[PDB]
Design an enzyme around this catalytic site. Structure first.
Site, mmCIF file in Angstrom:
data_model
loop_
_atom_site.group_PDB
_atom_site.id
_atom_site.type_symbol
_atom_site.label_atom_id
_atom_site.label_comp_id
_atom_site.label_asym_id
_atom_site.label_seq_id
_atom_site.Cartn_x
_atom_site.Cartn_y
_atom_site.Cartn_z
ATOM 1 N N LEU A 157 0.818 -1.216 0.000
ATOM 2 C CA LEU A 157 0.000 0.000 0.000
ATOM 3 C C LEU A 157 0.849 1.262 0.000
ATOM 4 C CD1 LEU A 157 -2.946 -1.030 2.360
ATOM 5 C CD2 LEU A 157 -2.988 -0.813 -0.148
ATOM 6 N N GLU A 182 4.865 3.124 1.895
ATOM 7 C CA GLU A 182 5.981 3.158 2.840
ATOM 8 C C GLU A 182 5.907 4.469 3.622
ATOM 9 O OE1 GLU A 182 9.615 2.663 0.529
ATOM 10 O OE2 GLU A 182 9.260 0.508 0.318
ATOM 11 N N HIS A 216 8.494 6.149 6.902
ATOM 12 C CA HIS A 216 9.348 6.343 8.086
ATOM 13 C C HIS A 216 9.672 5.029 8.806
ATOM 14 C CE1 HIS A 216 11.211 8.461 11.432
ATOM 15 N NE2 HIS A 216 10.358 7.902 12.271
ATOM 16 N N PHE A 217 10.576 4.251 8.203
ATOM 17 C CA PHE A 217 11.035 2.929 8.708
ATOM 18 C C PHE A 217 10.010 1.772 8.647
ATOM 19 C CE2 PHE A 217 13.972 5.990 10.649
ATOM 20 C CZ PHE A 217 15.212 5.427 10.347
ATOM 21 N N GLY A 218 8.716 2.090 8.548
ATOM 22 C CA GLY A 218 7.656 1.092 8.384
ATOM 23 C C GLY A 218 7.162 1.005 6.949
ATOM 24 N N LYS A 219 6.453 -0.084 6.646
ATOM 25 C CA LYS A 219 5.729 -0.241 5.381
ATOM 26 C C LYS A 219 4.348 -0.805 5.684
ATOM 27 C CE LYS A 219 6.733 -3.824 2.686
ATOM 28 N NZ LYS A 219 7.534 -4.713 1.801
ATOM 29 N N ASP A 222 2.532 14.726 11.296
ATOM 30 C CA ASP A 222 2.641 14.258 9.918
ATOM 31 C C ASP A 222 1.306 14.402 9.158
ATOM 32 O OD1 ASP A 222 4.222 13.170 7.875
ATOM 33 O OD2 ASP A 222 3.779 11.125 8.444
HETATM 34 C C1 LIG Z 1 -2.706 6.463 5.249
HETATM 35 C C2 LIG Z 1 -2.038 6.291 3.875
HETATM 36 C C3 LIG Z 1 -0.837 5.361 3.944
HETATM 37 C C4 LIG Z 1 0.244 5.712 4.729
HETATM 38 C C5 LIG Z 1 1.374 4.911 4.814
HETATM 39 C C6 LIG Z 1 1.435 3.722 4.098
HETATM 40 C C7 LIG Z 1 0.381 3.345 3.299
HETATM 41 C C8 LIG Z 1 -0.760 4.158 3.210
HETATM 42 N N1 LIG Z 1 -1.824 3.787 2.385
HETATM 43 C C9 LIG Z 1 -1.764 4.321 1.012
HETATM 44 C C10 LIG Z 1 -2.925 3.115 2.893
HETATM 45 C C11 LIG Z 1 -3.041 2.857 4.271
HETATM 46 C C12 LIG Z 1 -4.194 2.236 4.714
HETATM 47 C C13 LIG Z 1 -5.202 1.883 3.800
HETATM 48 C C14 LIG Z 1 -5.007 2.183 2.448
HETATM 49 N N2 LIG Z 1 -3.900 2.771 2.058
HETATM 50 N N3 LIG Z 1 -6.191 1.297 4.506
HETATM 51 C C15 LIG Z 1 -5.848 1.271 5.759
HETATM 52 N N4 LIG Z 1 -4.634 1.847 5.948
HETATM 53 C C16 LIG Z 1 -3.890 2.004 7.202
#
Ligand SMILES: CCc1ccccc1N(C)c1cc2c(cn1)ncn2C
Ligand code: NA
Ligand code: NA
Ligand code: NA
Length: 293
Positions: free
Chosen positions: A29, A31, A33-36, A142
């Site tokens: 989905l 990335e 800050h150190f997490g994905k 953020d």
């Molecule tokens: C909140 C957007 C985001 C931030 C960091 C990493 C991926 C994402 N994205 C793009 C995402 C998060 C999501 C999601 C759909 N997209 N549904 C639940 N979450 C937490």
């Protein structure tokens, strides 16, 4: 006599404990800050019928992820993404999945169905989410469109808490030690100057997010793109200093195309140089509501 063994205790299944073996990756989905974050299906029946979930994991930042998990576990709000649980030294955060994705992805693809009225409704919802977070004594740090998820055409939710910090009781701000990979074009002067973060610093960031919303997250009109036009693109390590001086002079991001002045005035109240002069989240809500009805 016979072999002695342990009495098997009565076990109750924890609905917030996701087994690794059933947590099946579909795709990435994003990335941050150190997490994905990954789209998975939690599929205990092994037939592709299980719920889709967003899974945050790391590529000692395990400690930061643990604090984030615990923050999100205790946040309950219509405009904050839902905690579902954990998959367990290591650990993964399991959240609800919002198919429409971020405002950064959604708005450019949906301009025709999202008019000013709807934009202002999203703005209120972001403000309610933030005012809730601030009532729990957290600073988000953020707040940008890329971190706002689309639940439906009618609802958004704050979607990531990777940088979120507690403000100490009887104190007005949190001092950041780590400030590398900071979203500087979303940051208030006190954050850039002194690494200090108030609730009012989130109000500033909301102003920039509101700008993004009003431009439908157009890449060529991004806060980064527009500020770099203002200050010069190619300055490298001197960029943040040139940005600080620009803001000291009273310069701010311009009025979005087709954005009425009355909406822009609310945005400008987010960007008073002194934190104490800025509008609150509640006064913004009142302001948008007045323009809606
Ligand atoms: C909140 C957007 C985001 C931030 C960091 C990493 C991926 C994402 N994205 C793009 C995402 C998060 C999501 C999601 C759909 N997209 N549904 C639940 N979450 C937490
Ligand atoms: Na706790
Ligand atoms: Na929760
Ligand atoms: Na989908």
């Amino acid at each position: 006599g016979d072999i002695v063994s342990e009495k098997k205790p009565a076990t109750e299944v924890d609905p917030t404990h996701f087994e690794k073996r059933f947590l099946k990756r579909i795709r990435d989905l994003g990335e941050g800050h150190f997490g994905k974050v990954e789209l998975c299906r939690y599929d205990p029946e092994g037939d592709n019928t299980g719920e889709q979930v967003a899974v945050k994991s790391l590529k000692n930042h395990i400690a930061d992820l643990k604090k984030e998990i615990e923050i999100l576990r205790n946040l309950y709000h219509e405009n904050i993404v839902k905690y579902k649980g954990i998959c367990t030294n290591g650990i993964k955060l399991i959240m609800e999945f919002l198919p429409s994705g971020s405002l950064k992805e959604y708005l450019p693809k949906n301009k025709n169905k999202i008019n000013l009225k709807q934009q202002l409704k999203y703005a209120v919802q972001i403000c309610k989410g933030m005012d809730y977070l601030g009532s729990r004594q957290y600073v988000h740090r953020d707040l940008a469109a890329r971190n706002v998820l689309v639940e439906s055409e009618h609802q958004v939710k704050i979607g990531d808490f990777g940088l979120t910090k507690a403000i100490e009781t009887d104190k007005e701000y949190y001092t950041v030690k780590d400030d590398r990979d900071s979203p500087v074009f979303w940051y208030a002067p006190e954050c850039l100057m002194q690494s200090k973060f108030y609730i009012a610093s989130d109000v500033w960031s909301f102003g920039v997010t509101l700008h993004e919303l009003l431009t439908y997250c157009d890449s060529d009109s991004s806060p980064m793109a527009l500020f770099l036009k203002m200050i010069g693109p190619t300055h490298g390590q001197m960029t943040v200093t040139r940005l600080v001086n620009t803001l000291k002079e009273g310069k701010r991001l311009p009025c979005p195309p087709n954005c009425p002045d009355e909406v822009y005035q609310l945005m400008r109240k987010c960007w008073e140089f002194q934190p104490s002069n800025r509008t609150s989240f509640q006064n913004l809500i009142e302001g948008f509501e007045a323009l809606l009805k």
